[PDB]
């Protein structure tokens, strides 16, 4: 795990890093997503220890991992993603690394749940929660094909999706 990644990165150079990235991408493609979490974790560990858009992505991932329900880190990551120029496979790789991470997926789900709970408490249902959900969906759907931009927001469907949460909250309030 960590020891193996450190041993692999010990021979750290430009060519070594390029080869490691290519191998990680190939492994992620073969596993259909399984290797993405391992590649992201290895990249984050390398950046954290003797690290030297990759640095920004690693910092955002570290902030998300540290704060399961953190909001400032999420806002910073959203700003960084928005301020990313369209490019050939760069944004695709970033989104794939973000999405294909079971820890990352769990953190995104927890953040979405916290945002939904806060929205229910504030009674302001539709809004950074929508942007976060769109980013999560784009990250999840990036693995379908290469050279992908994003996925539809589905604002109309968002209200229908949130309707079950409102019904559950109303049921809980009536019971209490």
């Amino acid at each position: 795990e960590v020891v193996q990644r450190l041993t692999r990165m010990v021979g750290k150079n430009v060519k070594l890093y390029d080869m490691v990235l290519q191998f990680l991408r190939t492994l992620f493609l073969r596993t259909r997503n399984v290797h993405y979490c391992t590649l992201r974790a290895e990249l984050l560990m390398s950046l954290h220890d003797l690290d030297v858009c990759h640095k920004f992505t690693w910092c955002l991932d570290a902030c998300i991992r540290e704060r399961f329900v953190d909001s400032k880190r999420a806002r910073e990551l959203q700003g960084f993603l928005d301020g990313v120029k369209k490019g050939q496979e760069q944004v695709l790789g970033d989104l794939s690394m973000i999405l294909c991470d079971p820890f990352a997926i769990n953190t995104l789900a927890l953040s979405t749940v916290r945002h939904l709970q806060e929205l229910v408490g504030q009674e302001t249902l539709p809004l950074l929660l929508l942007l976060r959900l769109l980013a999560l969906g784009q990250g999840a759907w990036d693995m379908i094909d290469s050279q992908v931009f994003k996925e539809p927001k589905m604002e109309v469907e968002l209200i229908t999706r949130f309707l079950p949460m409102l019904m559950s909250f109303l049921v809980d309030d009536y019971t209490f």
């Binding site: 009674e123 249902l125 209200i159 309707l163 409102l166 019904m167 909250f169 109303l170 309030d173 009536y174 209490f176």
Partner: peptide, 22 residues
């Protein structure tokens, strides 16, 4: 304050269903 809490809960429940169309 139980009556006030119940009234607030009822109002919130009524308002929650108003956003279904929107």
């Amino acid at each position: 304050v139980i009556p006030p809490g119940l009234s607030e809960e009822e109002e919130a429940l009524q308002k929650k269903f108003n956003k279904l169309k929107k």
